[PDB]
Amino acid sequence: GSRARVYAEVNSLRSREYWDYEAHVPSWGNQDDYQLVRKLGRGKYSEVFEAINITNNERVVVKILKPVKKKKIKREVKILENLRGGTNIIKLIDTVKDPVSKTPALVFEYINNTDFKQLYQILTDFDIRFYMYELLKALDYCHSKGIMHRDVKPHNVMIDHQQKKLRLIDWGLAEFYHPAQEYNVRVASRYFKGPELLVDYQMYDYSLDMWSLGCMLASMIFRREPFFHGQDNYDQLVRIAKVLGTEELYGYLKKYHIDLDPHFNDILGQHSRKRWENFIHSENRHLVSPEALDLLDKLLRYDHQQRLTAKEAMEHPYFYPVVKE
Ligand SMILES: Brc1nc2nc[nH]c2c(Br)c1Br
């Protein structure tokens, strides 16, 4: 049907215990060592707090897990253990529980994050290349470890713009890649969902994350954030098709024998593929180069199998100034 071009056998070549997260038994330390200081965010499965470890004064972030399947908890914990030491992946310091209620929580290194909405309107050309390269290091690492993140978006990419530190966070949707496995398409954020998800194609792979990264790159170089701003999941595909083209969508569907929900017939319209140069204007032109556009064109493609891998993207000339520095 479809297979990843890279890392397709990673998990099968490793011990079963590497990927069989349902069999993983975490060691749960004592949350009483941590003092919560301030709320940093909430999702439907967790709430996140800045905290201090009272035994050593370390500032950390505590993610308290709430209406969370025990299976989903094991999945996230095992994935984070497997990613230990990976470049630009958030460091899991410990897995802890309230010793009375037994509610589990994850303790992460602290990052002093710069608000992305303001940041993405003031990045320089070099900054964009630099941070995209840093994020690619994280994705190549997790892909090489047999793991798809499945929720790449600005809110999950912490950037300390003072120290030039980037971390990919929130591995709660991440999954192990096994060839031919059919996955749930209800992953990622609307604006960052790949076309495969929007057309209900379940045999996807690491390349989903490369679509999401391409969406981020487009928003940075063009300053339209989010770049593809759908009103719902149906409109999200329409917004993509208005740029990539409708005939081109149909060729992708045909290649993979994908059935299209007939509600799309009355909303997709007919759209030519647009040149990426159409998005250049006086305020973003200093961020756009031929290299940037060539890279973007090779990421924001319908055909997931023909998108650049994270490594291929890192090798692209767009990043040569970063490597040289
Ligand atoms: Br983990 C983690 N999650 C967060 N959510 C909002 N800010 C966050 C930070 Br900083 C970290 Br570290």
Curated annotation (Swiss-Prot):
Enzyme class: transferase
Pfam families named among the record's database cross-references: Pkinase
Residue(s) carrying N6-acetyllysine: K91
Domain Protein kinase: 34-319
Modified residues (Phosphotyrosine): Y7
List of residues binding ATP: L40, G41, R42, G43, K44, Y45, S46, E47, V48, K63
Catalytic activity entry: L-seryl-[protein] + ATP = O-phospho-L-seryl-[protein] + ADP + H(+); L-threonyl-[protein] + ATP = O-phospho-L-threonyl-[protein] + ADP + H(+)
Database matches in SUPFAM superfamilies: Protein kinase-like (PK-like) (SSF56112)
Chief location category: nucleus
Inhibition and activation profile: Constitutively active protein kinase whose activity is not directly affected by phosphorylation. Seems to be regulated by level of expression and localization.
Phosphoserine modifications at: S12, S15, S282
EC id: 2.7.11.1
Transmembrane stretches, start-end: none
Keywords, comma-separated and alphabetical: Acetylation, Apoptosis, ATP-binding, Cell cycle, Cytoplasm, Kinase, Nucleotide-binding, Nucleus, Phosphoprotein, Serine/threonine-protein kinase, Transcription, Transcription regulation, Transferase, Wnt signaling pathway
PANTHER family recorded: CASEIN KINASE II SUBUNIT ALPHA
Entry function: Catalytic subunit of a constitutively active serine/threonine-protein kinase complex that phosphorylates a large number of substrates containing acidic residues C-terminal to the phosphorylated serine or threonine. Regulates numerous cellular processes, such as cell cycle progression, apoptosis and transcription, as well as viral infection. May act as a regulatory node which integrates and coordinates numerous signals leading to an appropriate cellular response.
More about this protein: Can use both ATP and GTP as phosphoryl donors. Phosphorylation by casein kinase 2 has been estimated to represent up to one quarter of the eukaryotic phosphoproteome.
Protein name per Swiss-Prot or TrEMBL: Casein kinase II subunit alpha'
Organism: Homo sapiens
